[PDB]
Amino acid sequence: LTPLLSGWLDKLSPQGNYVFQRRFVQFNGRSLMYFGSDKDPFPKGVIPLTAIEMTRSSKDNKFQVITGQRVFVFRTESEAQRDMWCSTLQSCLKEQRL
């Protein structure tokens, strides 16, 4: 619903060691969806904001979205992009608990 935040991010894969995959991710304020392509109609994965337990920045231009069961690692192109993604998720997380 009105996908406020959109971008191509490098998402960490659980397979292998430090192997990323280019996914087009969107954030509408209710769930974090990632697609194989922005032209793909159905997402490769959906992470509801209710399931999000925390979101924290990483060493490089990277941020972690931590749920109850899994952690998603996304890599941006710049620290500014990472900070915008991380602040937006933190803002929504803070308001969803109030």
Ligand X SMILES: CCCC(=O)OC[C@H](COP(=O)(O)O[C@H]1[C@H](O)[C@@H](OP(=O)(O)O)[C@H](OP(=O)(O)O)[C@@H](OP(=O)(O)O)[C@H]1O)OC(O)CCC
Amino acid at 58: S
Strands (E), 1-98: 5-12, 20-27, 31-35, 45-48, 52-57, 62-67, 71-75
Contact call for residues 23 and 4 (beta carbons, < 8 A): no
Quick one: 33 or 89, whose CB is closer to ligand X?
A: 33
Q: Under the criterion CB under 6 A, does residue 69 sit at the interface with ligand X? A: no
- Please report how close the Cβ of residue 55 comes to ligand X at its closest, in angstroms: 17
The whole-angstrom separation of Cα 98 and Cα 94 is 7
Q: Under the criterion CB under 6 A, does residue 68 sit at the interface with ligand X? A: no
Window 7 to 66, contacts with ligand X (CB under 6 A)? 11, 13-17, 19, 21, 23, 34, 44-45
The site for ligand X (CB under 6 A) is made up of 11, 13-17, 19, 21, 23, 34, 44-45
